[PDB]
């Protein structure tokens, strides 16, 4: 006998996120829950998961990453819920 | 008998995040929950889980990572709920 | 008999972040919860879990990671939940 | 009988941060929770968890480390939830 | 028969962080919770856990860390609610 409430009764404009869960019982991943409420900003990867033997042999290899750039970023209210409230991003 | 009860009575517009998680009963990983609320800002890997044996006989490799750079990043309220509140980002 | 609550009766605009787990009973994980609210700003990794035997024989490597640039980071309210306040971010 | 009464009864907006947990009963890790409010900002890790044997003979090799530049971060309220206050950034 | 009973009635207003665990009953970690609330700044690490066997035989190694750098971290109320306050960060 499982029993799970969750915002049973609500009155009056609330503004929520709400994740519920549940549950009754090279790479490997079997069972998981993943990246839910999530946010990637400006994010890199250069060499991931190269197949089996890669560059075996008598390789010669030169990497350079050159991240260098004028690169603006402005946010307001990131995963930030909000009720009776003023939110504004104002330039000059 | 398991019995959960959250946020059961609510009345006058809070700002929430709920997360409500009931369980009853190279890289490997069999179960799990990961990054429900999980923000990521400017994040970088450059070398992960090369395939096995990589490089293996021989290798002249010359690695140069150089992050330089006028970047800016401006962020209000990150992960933040808020009710009967100002947020602003004023520039000049 | 297990029971749990949780903000069972709320009134007036609370500003909340909730997390709330019942639970009743190279690299490897089983079973575990990870990262619920957790943020990354400006993270690096460089060479991580690499293969099997990488490198195995006469290698000859020159590794340079160069962190070095003139970024900014402004952040207000970081994981801080508020009511009834005013947060801002002026420049000039 | 296990019972647990978090925060029953709440009148008057309050900010708060809540983290319940019930439970009754190379690198390997079995159960655990891990980083449930958790802020890393400007980590590093060069060398992480390389595979077995990795430059196992005859191995040549010159790492260089370089955190240099002109980096700059400006927070207020990191994990600090607040109410009827006044937070603010401000730059000249 | 166990009871815990945390912040049963509250009003007011109050800014609170609450952390409530309740629990009846190379590297290797079997159960535990880590970094509930945990804040890492400029934190480093070069060489962890490496794979093995490494540099087993032979080995001519150079290894050079250099933190040498302008950084500047200008942090106000780290981990510490408040109510009915004034935080600010003011610059010239």
Do not use: C, Q
């Amino acid at each position: 006998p499982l029993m799970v409430k969750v915002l049973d009764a609500v009155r009056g404009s609330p503004a929520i996120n709400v994740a519920v869960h549940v549950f009754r019982k090279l790479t490997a991943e079997e069972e998981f829950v993943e990246g839910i409420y999530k946010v990637e900003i400006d994010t890199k990867s250069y060499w991931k998961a190269l197949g089996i033997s890669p560059f075996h042999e008598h390789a010669e290899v030169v990497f350079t990453a050159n991240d260098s750039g004028p690169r603006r970023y402005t946010i307001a209210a990131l995963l930030s819920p909000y009720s009776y409230s003023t939110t504004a991003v104002v330039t000059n």
